[PDB]
């Protein structure tokens, strides 16, 4: 790159911009870390709720299989149409799109509530709420993973700047400064020579 005073000023300005960018990215990472540590607590709550839902769902399954034959519960599972009515809107977090799950779970798929075995309704409702709690857990996990990936990206950018962009600009600045100082030294030497020659050629000629 061309060493000039104007180019030296441009390099110094670029160094200042890089330092300001490092500070800005650190502030962004601070905000991301605050959001991430909120989301980790929220996901912990969701996971505990999922634990309780799974506990009661398995209890209901065991009680139903004790009080009803496996063939009957298997046929009941066959009879209900699958709750395939699911979709994920593209939630946008920090400029990134994430799939946010939502399930309809229509009650029209429940067959003969008063005609089913004794504990089939209880197991059905327990597993339905367990599944929707699982969808809640999945939403929390995907949001947390996206925020963590954003934190890692910001850390990558900050590290790259502070480690290879700023030192390179500093080295370029010192190189340009040395070249300019050398040119100034050469100019001073030439000025000394021509002053000496002025004095000498005036002295002998008189």
């Amino acid at each position: 790159v061309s060493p000039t005073r104007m180019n030296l000023l441009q390099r110094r300005g670029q160094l200042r911009l890089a330092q300001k960018g490092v500070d800005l990215l650190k502030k962004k990472r601070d905000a991301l870390v605050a959001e991430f540590f909120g989301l980790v607590r929220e996901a912990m709550e969701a996971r505990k709720a999922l634990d309780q839902a799974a506990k009661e769902a398995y209890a209901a399954l065991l009680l139903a299989q004790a009080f009803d034959g496996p063939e009957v519960v298997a046929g009941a599972a066959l009879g209900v149409p699958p709750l395939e009515g699911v979709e994920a809107e593209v939630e946008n977090v920090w400029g990134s799109k994430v799939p946010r799950l939502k399930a309809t779970f229509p009650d029209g798929a429940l067959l003969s509530p008063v005609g089913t075995p004794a504990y089939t309704l209880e197991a059905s409702r327990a597993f339905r709420r367990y599944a929707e709690a699982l969808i809640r857990v999945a939403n929390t996990e995907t949001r947390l993973k996206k925020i963590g990936e954003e934190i890692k990206k910001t850390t990558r950018r900050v590290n790259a700047l502070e480690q290879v962009v700023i030192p390179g600009i500093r080295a370029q600045i010192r190189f340009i400064q040395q070249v300019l100082e050398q040119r100034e030294r050469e100019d001073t030497f030439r000025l000394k020579r021509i002053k000496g020659k002025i004095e000498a050629r005036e002295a002998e000629e008189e």
């Binding site: 991430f36 980790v40 996901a43 912990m44 996971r47 505990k48 999922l50 634990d51 799974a54 506990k55 769902a57 398995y58 209890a59 399954l61 519960v73 298997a74 009941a76 599972a77 066959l78 209900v80 149409p81 699958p82 709750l83 395939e84 699911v86 979709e87 994920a88 799939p99 799950l101 399930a103 798929a109 089939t120 197991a123 059905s124 597993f127 339905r128 367990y130 599944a131 699982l134 969808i135 857990v137 999945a138 996990e141 995907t142 947390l144 993973k145 963590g148 990936e149 934190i151 890692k152």
Partner: protein
């Protein structure tokens, strides 16, 4: 959605109308999970923790550019009846996505 766990849990999820697969070992569950992903109809796949501790080892083999069929590990009903380790899972998750062992 879809769930991959022991046949009891798969039957219980089919009881609520959700796709379920019964698997006893990790390789069988992952093999069927690949075909399930290739199907792509379900937006979410649940896999047992005692079956596949880390389904991230299978998420990225398929769905290379798309993430809509999200997947997550879950505690199987056998150990969920005993109890799920929420705090250990949270610590390992924050370590996995950050890596600084920061808690309390």
């Amino acid at each position: 959605m879809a769930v991959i766990a022991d046949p009891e849990t798969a039957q219980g999820f089919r009881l609520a109308g959700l796709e379920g697969y019964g698997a006893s070992s990790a390789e069988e569950a992952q093999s069927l999970l690949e075909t399930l992903v290739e199907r792509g109809g379900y937006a979410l796949v649940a896999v047992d923790e005692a079956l596949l501790p880390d389904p991230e080892r299978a998420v990225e083999r398929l769905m290379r550019g798309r993430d809509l069929p999200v997947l997550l590990p879950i505690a199987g009903l056998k150990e969920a009846f005993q109890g799920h380790d929420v705090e250990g899972y949270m610590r390992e998750l924050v370590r996995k996505t950050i890596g600084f062992d920061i808690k309390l």
